[PDB]
From Swiss-Prot, chain A:
It comes from Ovis aries. InterPro entries: NADH_UbQ_OxRdtase_chain4L/K, NUOK/Mnh_C1-like. The keyword Membrane applies. One of its GO terms (molecular function) is NADH dehydrogenase (ubiquinone) activity. The keyword NAD applies. It is a multi-pass membrane protein. GO terms for biological process: ATP synthesis coupled electron transport. It comes from the Eukaryota. The chain crosses the membrane at residues 1-21, 29-49, 61-81. Its EC number is 7.1.1.2. Keywords: Electron transport, Membrane, Mitochondrion, Mitochondrion inner membrane, NAD, Respiratory chain, Translocase, Transmembrane, Transmembrane helix, Transport, Ubiquinone. It catalyses: a ubiquinone + NADH + 5 H(+)(in) = a ubiquinol + NAD(+) + 4 H(+)(out). This is NADH-ubiquinone oxidoreductase chain 4L. Pfam families: Oxidored_q2 (PF00420).
From Swiss-Prot, chain B:
The lineage of its organism: Eukaryota, Metazoa, Chordata, Craniata, Vertebrata. Core subunit of respiratory chain NADH dehydrogenase (Complex I) which is composed of 45 different subunits. Interacts with TMEM186. Interacts with TMEM242. It comes from Ovis aries (Sheep). Coiled coil: none annotated. Its EC number is 7.1.1.2. This is NADH-ubiquinone oxidoreductase chain 3.
Swiss-Prot record, chain D:
Core subunit of the mitochondrial membrane respiratory chain NADH dehydrogenase (Complex I) which catalyzes electron transfer from NADH through the respiratory chain, using ubiquinone as an electron acceptor. Essential for the catalytic activity and assembly of complex I. This is NADH-ubiquinone oxidoreductase chain 2. It is found in: Mitochondrion inner membrane. Core subunit of respiratory chain NADH dehydrogenase (Complex I) which is composed of 45 different subunits. Interacts with TMEM242. Belongs to the complex I subunit 2 family. The keyword Mitochondrion applies. Its EC number is 7.1.1.2. One of its GO terms (biological process) is reactive oxygen species metabolic process. It is a multi-pass membrane protein. PANTHER family: NADH-UBIQUINONE OXIDOREDUCTASE CHAIN 2.
Swiss-Prot record, chain F:
GO terms for biological process: mitochondrial electron transport, NADH to ubiquinone; mitochondrial respiratory chain complex I assembly. Core subunit of the mitochondrial membrane respiratory chain NADH dehydrogenase (Complex I) which catalyzes electron transfer from NADH through the respiratory chain, using ubiquinone as an electron acceptor. Essential for the catalytic activity and assembly of complex I. It comes from the Eukaryota. Keywords: Electron transport, Membrane, Mitochondrion, Mitochondrion inner membrane, NAD, Respiratory chain, Translocase, Transmembrane, Transmembrane helix, Transport, Ubiquinone. The gene is MT-ND6. It is a multi-pass membrane protein. This is NADH-ubiquinone oxidoreductase chain 6. Belongs to the complex I subunit 6 family. InterPro entries: ComplexI_Subunit6, NADH_UbQ/plastoQ_OxRdtase_su6, Nuo/plastoQ_OxRdtase_6_NuoJ.
Amino acid sequence: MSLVYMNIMMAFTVSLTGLLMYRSHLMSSLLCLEGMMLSLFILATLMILNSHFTLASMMPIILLVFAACEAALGLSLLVMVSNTYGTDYVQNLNLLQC
Amino acid sequence: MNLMITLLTNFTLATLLVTIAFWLPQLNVYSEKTSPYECGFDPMGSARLPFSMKFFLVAITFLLFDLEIALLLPLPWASQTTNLNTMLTMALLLIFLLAVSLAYEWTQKGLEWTE
Amino acid sequence: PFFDVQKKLGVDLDHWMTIQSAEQPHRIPARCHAFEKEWIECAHGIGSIRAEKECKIEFEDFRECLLRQKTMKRLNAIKRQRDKLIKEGKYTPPPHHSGQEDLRP
Amino acid sequence: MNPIILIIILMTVMLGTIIVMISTHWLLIWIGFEMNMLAIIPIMMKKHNPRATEASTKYFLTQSTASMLLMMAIIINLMFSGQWTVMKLFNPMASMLMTMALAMKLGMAPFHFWVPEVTQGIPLSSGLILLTWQKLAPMSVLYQILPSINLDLILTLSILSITIGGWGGLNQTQLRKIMAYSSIAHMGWMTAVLLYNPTMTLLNLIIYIIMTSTMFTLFMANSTTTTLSLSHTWNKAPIMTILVLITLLSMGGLPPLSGFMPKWMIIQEMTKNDSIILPTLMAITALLNLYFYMRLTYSTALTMFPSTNNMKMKWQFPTTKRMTLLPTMTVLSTMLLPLTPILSILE
Amino acid sequence: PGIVELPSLEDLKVQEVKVSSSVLKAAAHHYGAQCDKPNKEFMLCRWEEKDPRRCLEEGKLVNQCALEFFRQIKRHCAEPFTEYWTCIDYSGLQLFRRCRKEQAQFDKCVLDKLGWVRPDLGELSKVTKVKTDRPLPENPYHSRARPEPNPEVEGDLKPARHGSRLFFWTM
Amino acid sequence: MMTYIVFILSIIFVMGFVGFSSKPSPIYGGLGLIVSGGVGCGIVLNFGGSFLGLMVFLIYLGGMMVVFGYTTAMATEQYPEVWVSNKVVLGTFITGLLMEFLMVYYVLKDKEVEIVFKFNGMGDWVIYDTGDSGFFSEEAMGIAALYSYGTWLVIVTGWSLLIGVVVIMEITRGN
Amino acid sequence: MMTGRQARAPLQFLPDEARSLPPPKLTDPRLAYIGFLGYCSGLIDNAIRRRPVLSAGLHRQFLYITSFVFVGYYLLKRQDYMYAVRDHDMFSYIKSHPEDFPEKDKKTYREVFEEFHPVR
Amino acid sequence: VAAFLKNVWAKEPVLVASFAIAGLAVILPTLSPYTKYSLMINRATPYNYPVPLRDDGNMPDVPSHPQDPQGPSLEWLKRL
Amino acid sequence: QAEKDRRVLQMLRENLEEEATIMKDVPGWKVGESVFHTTRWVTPMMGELYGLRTGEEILSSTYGFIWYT
Amino acid sequence: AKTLLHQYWDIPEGTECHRKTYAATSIGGASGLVVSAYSVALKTPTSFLEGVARTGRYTFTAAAIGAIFGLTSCISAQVREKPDDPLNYLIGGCAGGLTLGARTRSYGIGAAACAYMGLTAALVKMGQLEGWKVFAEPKV
Ligand SMILES: CCCCCCCCCCCCCCCCCC(=O)OC[C@H](COP(=O)([O-])OCC[N+](C)(C)C)OC(=O)CCCCCCCCCCCCCCCCC
Ligand SMILES: CCCCCCCCCCCCCCCCCC(=O)OC[C@H](COP(=O)(O)OCCN)OC(=O)CCCCCCCCCCCCCCCCC
Ligand SMILES: CCCCCCCCCCCCCCCCCC(=O)OC[C@H](COP(=O)(O)OCCN)OC(=O)CCCCCCCCCCCCCCCCC
Ligand SMILES: CCCCCCCCCCCCCCCCCC(=O)OC[C@H](COP(=O)(O)OCCN)OC(=O)CCCCCCCCCCCCCCCCC
């Protein structure tokens, strides 16, 4: 393929290996999720605009909408965590080990 | 071509007004002037403590609402299509669902602040 | 399981965005409309097992239209050879390739 | 939770799974998966205890990673094919990424880590809803892309899931962890035979759904969460002990019960394609599932464990729970063998 | 694969209409009305052949007819058309509504001297029919022979032989 | 070297992705994601999709601002790490930048690279189309066809957003 | 398998070709077994709710066996249709490709040679 | 329902105004006779080229010249 | 349309005639060989036209409209 | 890992002991690297030195088992002039089991590993001789 495709795929892999190794902080993992969503959006719209597939231009923006359909949800899964414990560390989420 | 030239010009004009503001005058730095200002007395605790927010629910609602109204932004261009009844019905349905979500937030005391 | 509700009720839901040869707005054609049309018309109703080896020429041409790998390889080879001849001093660019070219209109 | 909101959320879960099942577009598949995850998150948060918050957080992180991988594979297939038809893929990397994403969504090993913890941290209703209904859409997506999965990858995933579930089911006293490891082993069993004939996969899915629903509904009726209360059930109602005994004997793959229905015919589809080592290893590994099922039956029905004094009062109050479809489901899960060719309707 | 066929540089040589864009826009409607048949023939050939190399002569005829049209304008109505295209050329958006008086002068002069009538609203966007003698391309997409489809299913559905034939089951 | 403008913008894109994916602290992660969103909207604007780039820029700016409010509120530390306060964060940032620039140097030498797919080394300006698009931009008509054609997509998206609002109400309740 | 066969006319329980087959009799042994399954379900429903299992709710047991017989009859109709489809497709493919299924000679045992292994 | 309307107009007039505007915007386009005018105005705008048809010999509805009387005219749009 | 057709045909012919002069000593090369198996006309790609020209024409052609103010 | 098994299996049995031993050492080292990577992933060591010590220990143990198995199998195949015979692989499997027992400093583990890995290696040679398939390409 081209060059910008390689760079966007490299960015996606960089954000993927950023996500898969946690650093004791949930917000950083949520930022990694948003970054992978952004990389997928950019790759999709790059391919669509290159191939002149006009009717698929409804695809990325609609896709972007569903980003919040998890991302904001992740924040709603944090506040109860931050009400259970004083911080948002991922090492405090080990009660389900027995 | 012109947009990056304008961006670089404005960035250069902004960033030149601090190095002029830094290297020009006579400076006198001691370890009492640069302390954090808390109305004459030294503060209790740090400024990096958890600042317990109240409007988290409305923040998540704004997170959904920004893009859920960004879906409504191509409505000018959507007025140029041949099929107009379907476009009008879908746009009215979208804003009606927005109004239903806002009313559900209002009635369940979701817009009020905690504590 | 794939409960094909759409053809059962005749209701179109997402068949218009499936391919680039469908009813586009204002009849805007894709850059590889002809190749995809030929590949679809070749591999219609013969099954995927037969279509993987009976209509491979049209699908290969469509894939070449989508990503332009062989065109990039040919252009890279031509540019590399041109730069090598320039570096050896054996080639001079033509006047119409250097800027003073006087195009048609 | 308001009953209206609960009904709306359950209808949204059903609508998302239906959207995944009936759509002919990859973006609609991903949209249905996202809607299913979003509407299945608060079901686990029904009782508002911390363990629900840990289970919801772990499930959300795993499902978000799986959805990201699925969308990346969809975009790569779009790049290499230029269309959106839900059919065989045209890139082996896209097939690998889709198989990994669907393995994470199905909880198949070595992506099985979240399954017992999420199952243990949530109530029995959300656990049953998860372990039965949420394992329908990814199996349909795997059914659709049948000429695309690498054989070695899916077979390695299947044997790994079967071995890991059989090994993990031995060291548990909580019932929900036992059901989760059993679900992982059955997941491996269904994905072992998928590339040969998916009709056997659909048969195994139906049988596994029926038996899992029967066991979970019996757990509702007995109001048991651990092995000790399930043992204590003999004082309240011995008919429940009989039902759980015959059900756990069914899930062990013991004839003439309906749990011998899938596995046997799964073997019948692996020897026609000249694979004799793998079904033998798979049956030998399913002996471990039979082992901890036998341990559960020994604790529950075949031995009379000691009880407490307060159970006397429970003798004066009959059960008033809505045991929906429990006798029909038990009969289906136990005595369905002589109707074996009924599976021909699944073609 | 095959070598791409390209016409030589002598075949493409033609005297081009070397006027500005505003000159073309100012006399767009009369050019559309008067020189309609060769442009229509050329664009029908372009939409039916799907190949610029097979529509070269029609493009040559289109250029010749447009040059004849501008030559006929230049012989009689040089200065009102000069004023009109200058007034159109001044505007940044090349608006038609900013130059109505010079326009009215230009079509009045060209109607009195040449008998040309500006078409009304929506006339130039009409779809017409073209009488042409060239044969239709029987295969314009350069497709090869399609594979033969699989045979269909026909006949009565007889009952299954000895039932399911599955292990010991008799039906 | 102005013909490689999209390539340079993509280099800054992966640079920002390395910057915030090392997870130093969510403030600077948000700053890195803002920079990455800006150069990404620049890339897609260079490909012609100005509306999509402006929309993703606005959406991600709003999302990152709400995120920053959350981390100031809830995910904070006495001593946040900028990039060098932690050895592991600085180390992985350095190796990410090193791997990116190594890939740049390798693709800028023989104009070809094999990372799992195969990629060229010429600028992307070759793959553009040579013809005009008339009196409309294709992306604008394509997104405007959401209401005239995509009724099912609009219905399921509106239902998903309404259900999401209800879900946000139900999760953060406490009883 | 037969998915393409269910491609032109999908989501049909019984197509127009299923009506040319003989329907199963009401005295089918499988139908009687499904009715017995319904009777067992009625017995279990009476048993798990502390009711007399052979007397309480005769209408409930009647509806149980009636619904079981109904669903079992329709499922048996579909099963017979699918097996008829399998046999018809197999015979059509055998007839369509005679070179792939060539006839073999039937040598008598006076001509064929079998090795004898003594037991001693 | 007059008492409820008066009470809600005295308490929260903004919601009453919003609901009245919404009700008019919903029920009004189905009553006005000018929606078809918008339909043919949008359909009469020439984005694409009117590609001609080959003259087989029997096409009485399409013209040979744009100035011929046959064809879809827009004197109604000029009048309005 | 006619002017654009003649222009792109002229550019393709000019690039074809200078391809043989550039590549004459390379082994196994075929001048003007297509990359598509069909003989149908395809729309020329921007790299096929401006491959042997200076960068100012590149920036005027493939980036001129987007960068124009 | 496809090329390692193909590299080990295309060398004729009982012909070159050193190349077969090196290939078996590489296979054992790869398997030990996978095992140690999963071990240091799921069970975090207390320090970097402990983690690299565990990784080196697992890799060395698996490499020693593979090397001794390959050397013993090739030695048996050369000594007996029976290249297509599973008993040489049984002997090599028992030698690897004794190596595992020596590395684990116990005798019962060595005996059990001898028995089970000898049966497994004999079965592997049997499948290579008879053309058995473990991941069968579907055909019906
Ligand atoms: C109670 C304890 C002891 C139990 C002992 C049970 C028997 C021991 C041996 C069982 C082997 C497995 C079944 C083999 C069936 C073979 C059928 C057949 O067609 O064979 C020809 C087929 C031939 O392959 P094919 O038919 O696919 O190929 C066509 C034929 N050729 C080869 C000519 C091209 O054999 C096989 O496929 C391999 C057979 C050996 C399988 C080895 C793996 C299993 C090892 C034994 C495990 C036993 C359980 C251990 C645990 C017990 C519980 C603790
Ligand atoms: C079908 C019409 C179109 C409908 C869809 C489009 C709607 C567009 C406008 C969207 C509005 C979104 C927000 C709506 C919130 C309504 C619920 C609510 O919050 O009610 C509370 C309010 C009483 O106030 P209180 O309880 O104190 O509020 C707390 C802090 N103020 O309660 C009230 O004040 C009462 C609110 C309900 C009654 C309103 C009556 C309006 C009548 C207008 C004239 C007739 C219109 C006829 C059309 C049908 C109307 C139902
Ligand atoms: C090839 C593809 C085939 C696809 C087949 C699809 C078939 C239909 C869908 C089946 C999937 C499961 C559907 C039900 C999901 C679970 C619903 C659930 O958990 O409901 C909760 C409810 C709670 O009841 P209660 O005890 O009052 O509440 C306690 C307080 N929480 O109730 C309960 O907890 C009791 C259980 C209620 C539901 C039991 C019956 C349905 C599920 C089992 C299947 C039965 C056989 C029919 C289908 C056969 C094929 C699967
Ligand atoms: C470390 C902290 C940060 C430090 C550095 C800060 C730098 C300045 C940050 C603020 C400015 C951010 C700008 C982001 C991109 C904005 C794009 C834009 O303004 O586009 C406007 C316009 C779109 O119009 P369009 O429809 O395309 O018209 C073409 C037809 N005539 O576009 C055009 O007409 C096209 C003009 C040429 C466009 C070239 C491609 C985009 C160039 C992007 C430059 C880099 C932006 C970096 C942003 C970083 C943000 C943190």
